[PDB]
């Protein structure tokens, strides 16, 4: 287990990681002192020597040099010691362990490795400061964020091995994933809250920015496109410049709820030939979505186009934003005075619901729902009554927050957060729960020693009524604690139970593979599937289309 199917290994590195937006998707900012240490055996040849010798000359401590040279006999020349270390005439048919350089192929992984995607070949770009740096939108497959996450890096030694990494493994080829026949990388955080504000109709950008932005995009064709507006002051729309980043032969049609080829909600999406026609761009368009601009561009133009797409979208939106700016104050959880009155009573009327069911049940009138205890039915009624209270008080808050409320602004992008996160911050936080039920009776027939025995009312059984803003009360706080202790617990137990699944799943399947007859079989030759997937079709190359033979009127089938 530990020495034969999983060894410790030479030519490897490991470091803290941190995000860098001006770095192409498939790249990895390898810090210098590591690239000073790691080494790829290159064989002398007429094609290289001139470069190659200059390295042996540079010596193992100024970046683009090298360590060890090796000769016919197989004797190791050590470049840091040795009298003859500023000398040495490189002889064809020798080798030269050398400093990893820019644009080399390397396997760059994060543990745990529960994917193909947790291992992807990148493209080196050597840098100062001691962090493996990477592009944001290679975050997901690895499942990294930059609050400490440490990451490994392996280096190939063989010429064939380099190919294997650059040809089968590399980051652009993994973009569209077989796992869920969808793309596994999207556009996240800053970039994404931006890919949107930029694109509102309202958003207007005038000349001087336009020219920088234009220029910012590398693949820019150098043709100031003609401003939508020419009159008084010739502006461009957001959409307009973002359209530059979008290549040509790219066609996308969306349609959400209120969408009409006029789109008075700037709804859906319409894109014709590297040009955006209407509709805000947000996660549905440019997320790791199925219809996804990224699913499209990858299949249509090619992987390598889509790789360079990510960068360009990023660099423009990251910029515009940098000059527009964005924030979040407690003000962004505050809400309208008369709504904090409407929320209040919206809870209060639910507190009377419960009361009345309870006083009802206290008279043996409460009817048992076929097959559950009168006490089960009471509970379920109550639980529901305050789940619907929280959610109603919550929805109530979702509306004051105006189109400028920075929390909501992220929510509309789909960058972070949700309705729930508003609810708990601005409204009431809700019913706490342990093992599916509302707070137990640990003490005898009572929750805490600050309550009378036999007390099934909300307060007493773990309903927190205030918000994460106004603040909880002692009791509330202590129930709430029990909430996400359970949470933490099964979280770190979720990880152990599952860790084992993914080991076994792997070990049984493991040796299954599609053989050269389009069968599907293990090491014994015992057939398992007669066609892979039953259609012999790689999951990547596949997508949700409609079958219009299936639906609608015998008339309109024929119309």
């Amino acid at each position: 287990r530990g020495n034969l199917m999983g060894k410790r290994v030479d030519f490897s590195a490991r470091t803290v990681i941190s995000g860098d937006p001006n770095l192409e998707l498939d790249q990895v900012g390898v810090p210098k002192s590591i690239a000073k240490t790691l080494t790829y055996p290159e064989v002398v040849t007429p094609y290289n020597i001139d470069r190659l010798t200059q390295l042996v000359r540079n010596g193992p401590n100024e970046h683009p040099g090298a360590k060890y040279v090796i000769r016919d006999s197989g004797d190791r020349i050590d470049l840091r010691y040795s009298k003859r270390a500023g000398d040495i005439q490189l002889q064809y048919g020798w080798k030269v362990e050398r400093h990893i350089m820019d644009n080399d192929p390397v396997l760059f992984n994060r543990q745990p490795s529960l994917h193909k995607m947790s291992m992807m070949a990148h493209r080196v770009k050597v840098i100062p400061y001691s962090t493996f740096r990477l592009n944001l939108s290679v975050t997901s497959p690895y499942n990294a964020d930059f609050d400490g996450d440490e990451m490994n890096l392996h280096v190939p030694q063989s010429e064939e091995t380099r190919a294997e990494l650059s040809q089968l493994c590399a980051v652009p080829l993994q973009i569209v994933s077989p796992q869920s026949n969808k793309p596994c990388m999207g556009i996240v955080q800053d970039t994404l809250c931006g890919i949107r504000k930029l694109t509102l109709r309202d958003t207007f950008i005038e000349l001087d920015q336009v020219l920088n932005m234009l220029y910012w995009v590398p693949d820019w064709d150098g043709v100031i496109p003609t401003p939508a507006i020419i009159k008084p002051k010739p502006l461009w729309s957001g959409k307009q410049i973002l359209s530059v980043a979008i290549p040509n032969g790219i066609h996308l049609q969306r349609f959400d709820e209120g969408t009409t080829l006029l789109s008075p909600k700037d709804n859906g999406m319409l894109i014709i030939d590297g040009q955006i026609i209407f509709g805000v761009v947000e996660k549905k368009t440019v997320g790791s979505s199925n219809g996804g601009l990224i699913h499209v561009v990858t299949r249509e133009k090619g992987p390598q186009v889509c790789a360079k797409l990510f960068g360009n979208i990023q660099k423009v939106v990251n910029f515009w934003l940098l000059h527009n700016g964005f924030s979040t104050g407690i003000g962004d959880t505050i809400a309208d005075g008369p709504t904090m009155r409407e929320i209040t009573e919206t809870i209060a009327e639910a507190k009377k619901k419960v009361l009345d069911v309870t006083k009802e049940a206290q008279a043996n009138l409460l009817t048992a729902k076929h097959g559950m205890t009168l006490r089960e039915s009471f509970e379920d009624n109550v639980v529901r009554f305050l789940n619907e209270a929280r959610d109603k008080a919550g929805r109530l808050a979702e509306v004051n927050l105006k189109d400028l409320n920075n929390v909501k602004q992220m929510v509309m992008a789909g960058s972070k957060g949700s309705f729930i996160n508003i609810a708990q911050m601005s409204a009431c936080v809700g019913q706490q729960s342990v093992e599916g039920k509302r707070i137990a009776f640990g003490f005898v027939d009572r929750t805490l020693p600050h309550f009378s025995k036999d007390d099934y009312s909300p307060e007493s059984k773990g309903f927190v009524e205030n918000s994460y803003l106004r603040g909880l009360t002692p009791q509330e706080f202590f129930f709430h604690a029990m909430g996400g202790r359970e949470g933490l617990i099964d979280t770190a137990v979720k990880t152990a139970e599952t860790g084992y699944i993914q080991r076994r799943l792997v070990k049984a399947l493991e040796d299954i593979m599609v053989h050269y007859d389009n069968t599907t079989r293990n090491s014994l030759g015992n057939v398992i599937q007669f066609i892979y997937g039953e259609d012999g079709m790689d999951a990547a190359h596949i997508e949700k289309q409609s079958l219009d033979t299936i639906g609608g009127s015998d008339a309109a089938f024929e119309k």
Partner: protein, 114 residues
């Protein structure tokens, strides 16, 4: 540790010239000036005044990455004008304002008490 010394921001290395000029391949009458060991203080000011002159078509700058102290100006000018002049005129135009200012401040500095 991997940290590069601070002086590598305003001091030119070995065979590294303040201006390295290349002619933009995509457009015509167009030019991309690399500026080494300089930053936004400079490129922004050049760009603003590189747009006041009415015989200029296009100008923009960008710091390709903040780690390094380089920046890339791109100028495209009208049929006739050679950007190297557009830039020269520009630069001079600036210097005259800065002198102008330097005087005018020193003028009004002197009139006040303390």
């Amino acid at each position: 540790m991997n940290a590069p010394d601070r002086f590598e921001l305003f001091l030119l290395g070995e065979g590294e010239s303040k201006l390295k000029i290349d002619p933009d391949t995509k457009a015509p009458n167009a030019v991309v000036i690399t500026f080494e060991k300089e930053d936004h203080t400079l490129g922004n000011l050049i760009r603003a005044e590189l747009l006041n002159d009415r015989k200029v078509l296009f100008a923009a700058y960008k710091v390709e990455h903040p780690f390094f102290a380089r920046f890339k100006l791109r100028i495209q000018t009208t049929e006739g004008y050679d950007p190297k002049d557009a830039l020269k005129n520009a630069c001079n135009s600036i210097i005259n304002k800065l002198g102008a200012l330097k005087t005018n401040f020193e003028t009004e500095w002197n009139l006040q008490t303390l």
